[PDB]
Amino acid sequence: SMSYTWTGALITPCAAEESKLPINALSNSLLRHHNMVYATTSRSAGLRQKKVTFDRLQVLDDHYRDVLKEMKAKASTVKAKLLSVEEACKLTPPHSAKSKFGYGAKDVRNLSSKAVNHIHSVWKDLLEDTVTPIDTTIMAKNEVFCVQRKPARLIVFPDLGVRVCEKMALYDVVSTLPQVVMGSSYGFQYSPGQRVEFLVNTWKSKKNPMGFSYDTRCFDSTVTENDIRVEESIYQCCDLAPEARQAIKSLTERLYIGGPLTNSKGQNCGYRRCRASGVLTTSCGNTLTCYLKASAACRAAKLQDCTMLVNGDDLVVICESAGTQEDAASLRVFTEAMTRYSAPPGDPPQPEYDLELITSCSSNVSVAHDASGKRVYYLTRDPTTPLARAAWETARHTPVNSWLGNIIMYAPTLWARMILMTHFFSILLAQEQLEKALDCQIYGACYSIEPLDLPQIIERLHGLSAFSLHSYSPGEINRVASCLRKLGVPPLRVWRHRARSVRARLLSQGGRAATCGKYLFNWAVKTKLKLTPIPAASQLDLSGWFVAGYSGGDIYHS
């Protein structure tokens, strides 16, 4: 079956679309090569439509069914609950697309009778109708990138009322099942640090460790009706209220498997027979399907001690190496086996015998030293993307403050400390918006965060070491350095000279700011400071921050 069928109608833009980095008075204090940064618009949607329209073909051997059985067993221990409507509402993102039925996210969160009535009636349609396809909207995504240009990705999502419904039936499922079914291998249960510790222990649990990541060529399009249905047999293994089983069956037949795509102007763009990105089960399902296809594939290729870490469509496999010549052979089979499951490779996975050489979730493990000179591991990455965006957001406020999200998730990184924290705090001082809560996204979910809190938040996601790390490896430093030369970002020495000033600015502010300049820039000075636990750091409520991803699921918290 073809992943997609087009009618020829264009995927139209809902609003104005900028493709060129806006420039303001602050711009050059960060990135001088403006011709390097751009944003994807609905103008390239046609390209993307071409790269993802293809026919999927699957050959499921016993190794495939073997693993699927194991998973269903563990799945059978899960007892998901049926969210009521109010609860559902209370999980909808304050800035989530409004309903084509007269009410919006603001309406739903508050439980206005308009939204609650409609949802109650949408849910009923799911219980007495298990076939009529549910309409969807297809818009091109606007993401910023560096050149050397990729076509805009495609977002497909059902109406707000249906989204609320998905939660009532699946919210509790997608949060639980993954951990239970895949155990430690489930990547959305780890904070950046725990992810790093998991990969290290796992690397140490091998006499001869050998690893590789596996990138699927546009994974959503590879996903076939069979996958969507198998996913369901898995969900249906849970102890689920009867009404929920129906809704999950109904959502499956009428939505997740496929359905008509409607552009922003109401025209028909075509039909979908693969994964919809805007559904509650997108992240969970992918991860589920990706884990199943890569476990079978492991056995198919006789890989010794197959351990895996799976975050949605991203895959990492650390096993017991059996000889450099023997591994490259194994991986060939593995790729071939994945290809038979409709999970071909975008790039040939290649074996690495060096941990800090594998890239999962666009990141990697690297090393430095804490306050005690002890070797400590942290999660870092190429800063190209993060900065390019931090730049765009320097002259354009976005719904997703990437620079903040980035700082929270990469506090320990050489580039996030010297550049991101400095640059942006400097700007918060001038505007005096040091406490204005701002949105940002982590593993998918949108959180509201106040800048002055960062000190506590960071300590809570990485620990005190995120303020005293030093002697970063030469490999990392050189990468941060190069990327800067590329985008035209001033050298690191310049930033330290600026952080020295921003530190001083924050310190003078006393209070929570004084804490910020105290802990966030304590690396800019020579006479280091004490830095001890933060009293209100143990106050923060971070249980639900990293229990499950919701990328393309309509999720929000505090």
Query: What single-letter amino acid sits at 135?
Result: D
Contact with ligand 154 (CB under 6 A) among 64, 123, 378, 523: 523
Q: What is the smallest separation between the CB atom of 195 and ligand 154, expressed in angstroms?
A: 20
Residue 209 dihedral angles phi and psi, to the nearest 5°: -75, 140
Q: What is the smallest separation between the CB atom of 412 and ligand 154, expressed in angstroms?
A: 9
Residue among 401, 407, 519 nearest 455 (CA): 519
Contact with ligand 154 (CB under 6 A) among 418, 438, 457, 466: 418
Q: For ligand 154, which stretch binds (CB under 6 A), given 5-13, 385-393, 396-404, 488-496?
A: 488-496
Sheet architecture: strand order including 4-6: 4-6, 268-272, 259-262, 136-140, 154-157
215 annotated ligand binder: yes
Kindly write down the DSSP assignment for every residue of 104-134, as one continuous string.
-HHHHHHT-HHHHHHHHHHHHHHHH-SSSPP
Q: Which is nearer to ligand 154, 207 or 493 (CB)?
A: 493
Q: What is the smallest separation between the CB atom of 404 and ligand 154, expressed in angstroms?
A: 17
Q: For ligand 154, which stretch binds (CB under 6 A), given 42-50, 95-103, 398-406, 464-472?
A: 464-472
Mapped onto helix, strand or coil, the DSSP state of residue 542 is coil
Q: What is the smallest separation between the CB atom of 369 and ligand 154, expressed in angstroms?
A: 8
Q: For ligand 154, which stretch binds (CB under 6 A), given 65-73, 181-189, 190-198, 468-476?
A: 468-476
Q: What is the smallest separation between the CB atom of 180 and ligand 154, expressed in angstroms?
A: 39
Per-residue binding letters, 276-315, with ligand 154 (x by CB under 6 A): ----------------------------------------
Contact with ligand 154 (CB under 6 A) among 34, 74, 245, 496: 496
The total number of residues shown for the chain amounts to 558
Contact with ligand 154 (CB under 6 A) among 372, 493, 527, 535: 493
417 contributes a contact to ligand 154 by CB under 6 A: yes
Q: Which is nearer to ligand 154, 132 or 471 (CB)?
A: 471
- Beta bridge partners of residue 309, listed in sequence order: 316
472 contributes a contact to ligand 154 by CB under 6 A: yes
462 contributes a contact to ligand 154 by CB under 6 A: no
Mapped onto helix, strand or coil, the DSSP state of residue 432 is coil
Cα(507)–Cα(228) distance, integer angstroms: 54
What angle do helix axes 402-410 and 422-431 make, rounded to 10 degrees? 130
Closest-by-Cβ residue to ligand 154 is 417
Q: For ligand 154, which stretch binds (CB under 6 A), given 128-136, 140-148, 492-500, 502-510?
A: 492-500
* Residue 400: C-alpha distances to residues 69, 95, 353, 433, 444 (Å): 40, 11, 36, 17, 10
* Residue 24: C-alpha distances to residues 391, 424, 430 (Å): 10, 14, 15
Cα(88)–Cα(76) distance, integer angstroms: 24
Q: Which is nearer to ligand 154, 141 or 369 (CB)?
A: 369
Q: What is the smallest separation between the CB atom of 473 and ligand 154, expressed in angstroms?
A: 8
30 contributes a contact to ligand 154 by CB under 6 A: no
63 contributes a contact to ligand 154 by CB under 6 A: no
Count of H-run helices and E-run strands, the chain: 21, 14
471 contributes a contact to ligand 154 by CB under 6 A: yes
Cβ pair 486, 426 in contact under 8 A: no
- SS3 sequence, 214-251? EEECCHHHHCCHHHHHHHHHHHCCCCCCHHHHHHHHHH
Secondary structure letter of residue 489 according to DSSP: P
**Burial zone of 272 (CB within 10 Å; 0-12 exposed, 13-18 middle, 19+ buried):** buried
Q: Which is nearer to ligand 154, 38 or 472 (CB)?
A: 472
Q: For ligand 154, which stretch binds (CB under 6 A), given 174-182, 215-223, 261-269, 414-422?
A: 414-422
Kindly write down the DSSP assignment for every residue of 280-321, as one continuous string.
TTHHHHHHHHHHHHHHHHHHHTT-SS-EEEEETTEEEEEEE-
Mapped onto helix, strand or coil, the DSSP state of residue 366 is strand
470 contributes a contact to ligand 154 by CB under 6 A: yes
Q: Which is nearer to ligand 154, 157 or 425 (CB)?
A: 425
66 annotated ligand binder: no
Q: What is the smallest separation between the CB atom of 484 and ligand 154, expressed in angstroms?
A: 10
Q: Which is nearer to ligand 154, 212 or 523 (CB)?
A: 523
Q: For ligand 154, which stretch binds (CB under 6 A), given 343-351, 359-367, 469-477, 502-510?
A: 469-477
Q: What is the smallest separation between the CB atom of 417 and ligand 154, expressed in angstroms?
A: 3
381 contributes a contact to ligand 154 by CB under 6 A: no
Q: Which is nearer to ligand 154, 418 or 483 (CB)?
A: 418
| Residues 6 or more apart whose Cβ sits within 8 Å of residue 211 | 203, 316, 317, 318, 319, 351, 352, 353, 355, 358
521 contributes a contact to ligand 154 by CB under 6 A: no
314 annotated ligand binder: yes
Sort strands 209-215 and 37-39 into parallel, antiparallel or unpaired. unpaired
- Count of positions on this chain that bind ligand 154 (CB under 6 A): 10
Q: Which is nearer to ligand 154, 273 or 417 (CB)?
A: 417
* Residue 407: C-alpha distances to residues 62, 66, 105, 404, 457 (Å): 45, 42, 28, 5, 10
Contact with ligand 154 (CB under 6 A) among 116, 140, 414, 516: 414
* Segment (H or E) for 135: none
492 contributes a contact to ligand 154 by CB under 6 A: yes
Q: For ligand 154, which stretch binds (CB under 6 A), given 133-141, 372-380, 410-418, 543-551?
A: 410-418
Q: Which is nearer to ligand 154, 76 or 522 (CB)?
A: 522
Which residues belong to the annotated binding site?
215, 313-314
Which residues belong to the annotated binding site for Mg(2+)?
215, 313-314
Binding site for ligand 154 (CB under 6 A): 414, 417-418, 470-472, 492-493, 496, 523
